[PDB]
Amino acid sequence: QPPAYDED
Amino acid sequence: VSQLGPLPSGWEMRLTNTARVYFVDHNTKTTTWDDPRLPSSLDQNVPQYKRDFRRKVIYFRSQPALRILPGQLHIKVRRKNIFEDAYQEIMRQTPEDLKKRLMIKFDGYGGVSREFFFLLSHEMFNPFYGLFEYSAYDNYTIQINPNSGINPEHLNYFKFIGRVVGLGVFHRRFLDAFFVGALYKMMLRKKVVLQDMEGVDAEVYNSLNWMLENSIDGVLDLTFSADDERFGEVVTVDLKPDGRNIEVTDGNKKEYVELYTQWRIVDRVQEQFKAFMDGFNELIPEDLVTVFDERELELLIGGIAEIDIEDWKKHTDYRGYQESDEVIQWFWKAVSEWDNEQRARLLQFTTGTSRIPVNGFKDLQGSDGPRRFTIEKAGEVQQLPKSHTCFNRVDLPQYVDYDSMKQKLTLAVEETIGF
Amino acid sequence: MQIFVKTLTGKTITLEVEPSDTIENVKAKIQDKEGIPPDQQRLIFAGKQLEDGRTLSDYNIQKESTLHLVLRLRC
C-alpha cells in the first residue's frame, strides 16, 4: 500500500 | 503525462520517496498505484487474455490519434427520437469536431454519455429498421441485413452507425453491440473463415462443412455461382470470373467452400459494410484498432453484458450503511433472485447503462472518472429509490421490511427505465 | 369525474377526481393507492406539465382525460 490518504 | 489525457475531477498524482508514481483520490479519501485514466490493475491468477487486454488498451489509449480535442461538442436529442435526432446531430459534424468532449442533452452531461450510447445502440442495432437482422431466431446477436438497400439512403445510416460505434470507442462509451463474431473480424480486416458461417448461417455452415470431408460426386452438383435472395426475386452471381460454368466436385471443394463463404458473409454486404467502416474510420484509425484480435475488439466496443452479482457486491461502496444491514442484505437478495435482464435494468437505472468493463465492477466508470457503485442511506420509507447516473449511487431509504422494499425498488426501475 | 393516469409502462390507473381538485390533490390520490409520493410524481397532460398551484380544470382537463406519470428518480 502507498501513502494512505492523510492531510488535505 | 497528459498525452494520455488529463486526470479526473478530484485527483492528484504524487511521487513516492523513490519517484514511483502513485495517485490520490480526493473523492474516496484514498490513494492507489492505478492511474484512474487507465484500466485498473490485474490481480494475480487472471487469464492472459485479460492481462493482455489491459495492456493493449493502454497502447491504444496513448496514440495521438485517440486524443480528445480541446473544447466540446453538443448533441441535442429527444429520447423518443434518439435515432433520427442523433443522425442529424452527428452526420453534420466533421470527424475533428466529433473528437471534442461530448455534452449530450436530452430535450426537456458526462454521465448522459453512457445513457446516450447505451440507448442509441438499441435503436441502430434493432432489426426493425432493416439495418441489421438477427442471424437466427435463436441467437439474438445481429449482423448486416443484405436487404437494407430497399431504403435508398441506407448506406448513409451505416456511415452514421459506424461513426457512432467508433465514437463510443473514441469517447470510452459502451454499446449494446451484440454482433456476430465475423463482423469484428471484418472490423480488423482479418480474413473470414468457414467457421464464421456458423454464427451467420448455422444451416449452410453444416452443409459446407460436409463437402470438405465426405463424398461429393454423385451426391451434389453445383457451379462457382450462388443464388442471392432479395425481395422475392433471385439472382445468380459468379463466385469468380466465369463461375456459373466451372462445375464443382470432390476435387473442387476447397475452392467453392472458400468462395461461397467469402461471398455470403463478406461480399454480399460489401456496400453496407464499406460505408460502415468509412464512418467508423473517421474516428478510429484502422491501423490502430488492429492491435486487438476479434475478441478484444468485441469487448472494447461493447463491454461485458452479463452482470456478475458476486463481483458487484464485492465492489459496492456504502454510505450511511454497513455491509450487514437489513436493507443492504435485502437489496442483494433482490439481485440474486432477479434474472440478468432485471439486473441490467437496475444498472441501466443507477449508472445509465447495463454494460460493464472487462476488469469488472472494480473499475466501474462514472461520468468524471472512477466511481464505484454506491448505496447510500437517504429518503423515507414510502419514497422510491432514487439515483444519480453520474455518481453511480442510489439513495436507498431504510425500508422497515423486505416485501415493501422490493416493491418500491421495482416500480423505480420498471417505471423510469421500462425496458 | 374519472381521469386515467398512464405510467411509462402502460399501467392505466383509473382515479376519482373533480375539475376543482388541485394537481397536488391528484398525485395524493395516486400515492394512497400506488405508493409513489406526490413529491416525486410528475404528471403530463398533452405536452403540458400540470402544476400544483392550479386546479384540475385549469388545463382544460375534461372527463376520461389521460395524464402520463413521470417519476423523477434520476439526475
Numbering used by the authors:
A (entry chain C): 105 to 112
B (entry chain A): 383 to 490, 496 to 806
C (entry chain E): 1 to 75
From the paper:
To address the mechanisms of HECT E3-mediated Ub ligation, we studied Rsp5, the single essential NEDD4-family member from Saccharomyces cerevisiae. Rsp5 has a typical NEDD4-family domain structure consisting of a C2 domain, three WW domains, and a HECT domain. The catalytic HECT domain consists of an N-lobe that binds E2, a flexible linker, and a C-lobe containing the active site cysteine. Rsp5 binds via its third WW domain to a PPXY motif (residues 106–109) in Sna3, and ubiquitinates Sna3 at Lys125.
A synthetic Sna3C peptide with the acceptor Lys125 substituted with azidohomoalanine was linked by Click chemistry to a homobifunctional maleimide crosslinker. One arm was crosslinked to Rsp5WW3-HECT, and the other to a Cys side-chain substituted for Gly75 of Ub. This enabled us to determine the crystal structure of Rsp5WW3-HECT with the active site cysteine (Cys777) simultaneously crosslinked to the C-terminus of the Ub variant and to Sna3C (Rsp5WW3-HECTxUbxSna3C). The crystals contained two Rsp5WW3-HECTxUbxSna3C complexes per asymmetric unit, which superimpose with ∼0.5 Å RMSD. Noncovalent interactions between the HECT domain C-lobe and Ub involved in Ub transfer from E2-to-E3 are preserved in the Rsp5WW3-HECTxUbxSna3C structure. The Sna3C PPXY motif binds Rsp5′s WW3 domain in a typical manner. However, the overall Rsp5WW3-HECTxUbxSna3C assembly is distinctive, with the HECT domain active site and its covalently linked Ub facing the Sna3C substrate. The HECT domain architecture in the Rsp5WW3-HECTxUbxSna3C structure results in Ub being sandwiched between the C- and N-lobes. The Ub C-terminal tail adopts an extended conformation, secured through an intermolecular β-sheet with the HECT β-strand leading to the covalent linkage with the catalytic Cys777. Three-way interactions between the HECT domain N-lobe, C-lobe, and the covalently linked Ub are anchored by Ub’s Arg74.
